[PDB]
Ligand SMILES: CC1(C)C(=O)N(c2ccc(SC(F)(F)F)cc2)C(=O)N1Cc1c[nH]c2ncccc12
Ligand code: NI
């Protein structure tokens with residue numbers, strides 16, 4: 316079951332404007348919520364819906380997954396603003412990131428060390444907060460980073476393929492969709508997901524920033540990426556890559572998870588030369 320709480324909003328307060336994409340449990344909308352925030356009468360929102368076709372078990376799964384976000388207070392993680400458990404459809408309301416995901420943003424720029432370093436620090440800020448709170452993201456990638464009106468980068472999750480980035484995922488038959496080009500050697504081999512496997516992924520995100528979001532390991536198939544990465548292979552230095560940004564990547568791609576820096580260590584090294 317699920318017990319309604321202080322996060323509950325009256326369905327009458329949410330109007331739905333247009334659709335943004337598909338989503339795991341149903342349709343995702345851009346909308347407006349009324350008195351959901353202090354000193355702000357209306358708020359532009361993202362609405363995640365449970366498909367009306369979905370079962371009882373899966374409506375409660377959805378609510379209990381999204382309740383994890385009630386614990387979070389980091390301006391660098393997309394913020395939950397409210398739930399609607401009562402009646403149909405079942406909604407969760409969230410901060411609207413008006414400039415979309417970081418991969419689309421990067422591809423549309425088809426920047427300086429300072430902008431790349433800023434974007435990196437903001438990403439490392441949300442991930443440090445999540446990892447400290449026992450939250451291992453498991454799909455950290457530019458496509459899951461969101462960009463606000465003010466150009467702030469936040470950690471989100473725009474499910475797992477929206478079709479748009481369907482080449483980013485490998486179907487391991489029955490298993491499911493794996494983002495293999497972002498996965499650490501211990502994740503690929505043993506299904507080990509830790510803070511250290513999030514740090515590996517962050518290195519791939521830095522490579523995505525430096526290449527304006529090229530596909531990692533372009534011209535290797537999904538199975539060749541597995542073999543290459545498990546046997547100690549590394550992405551090449553992006554063209555025009557500043558030294559500092561590539562040193563950070565390499566730190567993140569130590570084969571032994573224990574030799575990688577923590578997100579806190581990454582924020583320190585970034586701040587020390589800002
Ligand atoms: C699908 C949805 C709403 C969601 O549920 N999440 C999410 C956020 C945080 C966490 S917690 C984590 F640790 F993963 F970040 C888990 C899911 C997102 O990021 N979404 C996309 C999204 C939000 N705002 C937007 N503005 C414009 C376009 C798309 C979006
Ligand atoms: Ni399920």
Ligand code: NI
Nearest residue numbers: 390391437440
């Ligand atoms: Ni900040």
Ligand code: NI
Nearest residue numbers: 478479481482
């Ligand atoms: Ni297609």
